[PDB]
Amino acid sequence: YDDLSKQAVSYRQISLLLRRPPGREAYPGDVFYLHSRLLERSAMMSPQKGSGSLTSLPIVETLSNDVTAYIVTNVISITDGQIYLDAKLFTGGQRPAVNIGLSVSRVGSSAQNKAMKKVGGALKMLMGEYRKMAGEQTSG
Amino acid sequence: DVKQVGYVQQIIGAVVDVTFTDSVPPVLTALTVDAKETGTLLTMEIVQHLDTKTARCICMSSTDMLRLRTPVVNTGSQITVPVGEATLGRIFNVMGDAIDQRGPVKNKVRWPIHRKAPTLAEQSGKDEVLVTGIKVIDLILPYCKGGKIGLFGGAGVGKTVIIMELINNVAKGHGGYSVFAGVGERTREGTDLYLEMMGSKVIDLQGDSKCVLVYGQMNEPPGARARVAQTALTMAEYFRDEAGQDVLLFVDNVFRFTQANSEVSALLGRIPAAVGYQPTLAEDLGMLQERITSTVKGSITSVQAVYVPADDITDPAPATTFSHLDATTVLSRSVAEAGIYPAVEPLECASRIMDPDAIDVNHYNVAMDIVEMLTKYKELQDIIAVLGIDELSEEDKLIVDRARKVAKFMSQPFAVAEVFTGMKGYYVQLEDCVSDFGSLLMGQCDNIPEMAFYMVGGLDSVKEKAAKMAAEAAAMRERARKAAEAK
Amino acid sequence: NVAMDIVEMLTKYKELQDIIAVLGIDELSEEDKLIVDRARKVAKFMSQPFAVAEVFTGMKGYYVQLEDCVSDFGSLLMGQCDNIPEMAFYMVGGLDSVKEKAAKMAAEAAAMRERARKAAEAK
Amino acid sequence: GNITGLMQLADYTYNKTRKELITAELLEIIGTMTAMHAGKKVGLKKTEFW
Lengths: 140, 487, 123, 50
Ligand SMILES: COCCOCCOCCOc1ccc(C(C)(C)CC(C)(C)C)cc1
Hints:
The structure is cut from a larger assembly and holds one copy of chain A (140 residues), two copies of chain B and one copy of chain D (50 residues).
Chain A: H1 4-17, H2 31-39, H3 70-76, E1 81-82, H4 87-91, E2 104-105, H5 114-136
Antiparallel strand pairs in A: 1-2
Chain B: E1 5-12, E2 15-19, E3 30-33, H1 35-38, E4 42-49, E5 54-59, E6 71-74, E7 81-82, E8 91-92, E9 110-111, H2 135-140, E10 148-152, H3 159-172, E11 178-185, H4 187-194, H5 196-199, E12 211-217, H6 222-225, H7 229-241, E13 246-251, H8 255-268, H9 281-289, E14 299-305, H10 316-322, E15 327-330, H11 333-337, E16 350-351, H12 361-384, H13 394-410, H14 431-441, H15 459-486
Parallel strand pairs in B: 8-12, 10-14, 10-15, 11-12, 11-13, 13-14
Antiparallel strand pairs in B: 1-2, 1-6, 2-5, 3-4, 3-6, 4-5, 7-9, 15-16
Helix pairs in contact in B: 12-13, 12-14
Chain D: H1 2-39
Fragment of triton X-100 binds next to strand 10, strand 15 and strand 16 of chain B.
């Protein structure tokens, strides 16, 4: 989905043109249901149903690195994880601009192949140390 | 065949409602009433049906002295605008009625204003580069054909001279005309911009002009100003499709294109979503931008000035505009006061086509190296003012020389102002420019002094200036030596 | 009484954030920076792992009993444990687990010095 | 550097709160206008149906 933040603007048009009572950030209030109908249809189905899947990587636009926006938190309140790209790093050459601190995957540990699970453990510890050792010195 | 007639039924400001006795015309359809009644011609476009026979229509002029239940003529279509060679060197309002007093316009056909956007098939996914001729732009900020560009400039930063030069270069390089769109333009600047196009011969009245002008002024209601950019862009789609060529589309501040539509949505009664911008913000803005695209048949590029209210990028009008832009030609008064013209600040600028998947590899690596260089020069500039140049190593002071050379080399003259200031202008190509910066980057042109790169174009052109400087200083020495030796 | 004093200490640490964020810890009185070095310890100690979040912290979860929760804060409040560094309190439960972790960090940190000595002598 | 880091957040929250205050005032006014529309009645619409 590229992207949901622009879907909400269209639904906002439809509501406001119908004079439905607005809410926070101009939105009606049933804008949460709008995305929950959509992202709950993603699932790893049961063996009773075929063990299929529907993975959903929605995209959402922030403003000046602000996860306190209404839509961003509506969707973090729905999704099974989070990937946070920072413009500070994208401008600073690092591309993809993932911030590992503000990023998380709530479920993928079970799915991560063991070959990658162990390497990920090592690098998670390493970056937990790098994140601290890079800031504590502050050029001291 | 006959023509349809309707009757007014209410007037509230710019808004007007029109009863009919038959099927109501389509939406955005223009409705004219003769000039004998109001005293002047009057057009209103349908926006919003209210019943099977009523049609709310926004009015583009003043509806003063308009009685009730007056006859109202259905044009049969929406606002048909002029198109063609005859459009050039002229000014047109929203309806295509020329306001420059310069007689009629001898056009053959007259196209509607709300043309649907190009289909996906008409598009060309291949991202191309517009050879602007301005090395500062071409190196760091390649204007992508069929793309949207940002221009950030107040007063006294060479904004006018830039857009004038763009018109000239695209008229000769790509063989393509241009078009200007003054949305909410101060009516003083219309004169100060139409007369600069006489001294620069961008509008040669006794010859071949290059740009069309479209002024929707502040003295006009928002129903007009909102429908301006569609007019100036309809002028450009003729040159894209029929003439089969590339086009520029200059847009005085898009902020004032957004505000006007906000006002229309207010008058219609639509609930303002956010800070006060219409709920249809991205729709009304995107219906415009999506027509500004490349094609199999041509291209329309759009250099768009953007006002940022309160210097806040998070406001929906800038934020929605930025989602459509491709490059940002920032202008600064600082570099302008430092002698640089065009007054571009390359580091705070940015582009989207800067990717070797789009452009050739050399153009990319050279530009990224210049960005590295000038960034390092900014840091060392923060050190020199504190410590001193003698504090720096031998490796650092070399790039402190070359970065100064680069920044002075960005300074380019303009054929537009060739009469005003006297100096010639230089249309420098793309590939030649990359070899020039690659020479200045690989150090193979370091013996040349700094000031030789000031206000020149092309490495092949500065060397004449370097020789001129050396010859001049040698003549001053030969003058001083013999003036002192004679006595 | 312990909780009242913990909350009080953090109420002061919060007021000093407005300075530390601006100037630095080096511009604070000795008393003040001791409160800083202690409130940071309390805040890091408040953290602990849960059996549910083992996937994330990568640690087994502890179950801190109530009576063992107060003596630890009281020791950390009366200055009974200031030689311990700040990071030994991060993501543990019970001061016994701290002193284990502090031993781990001291061992690893010293081993880096003997290791760097051999890396320097061989170099 | 630190003061600038604080200044951007202050400018950011200042403008955030500014815009939210604007939106809120609008919705107050629209709430009142809408409530009055509910207060106003419908007419009769008497006309020949036959
Ligand atoms: C990776 O390629 C990116 C290319 O992006 C092209 C479109 O860029 C959109 C421009 O975004 C900005 C961002 C910030 C600004 C600033 C904050 C510098 C403007 C200012 C100082 C006037 C408020 C201007 C434009």
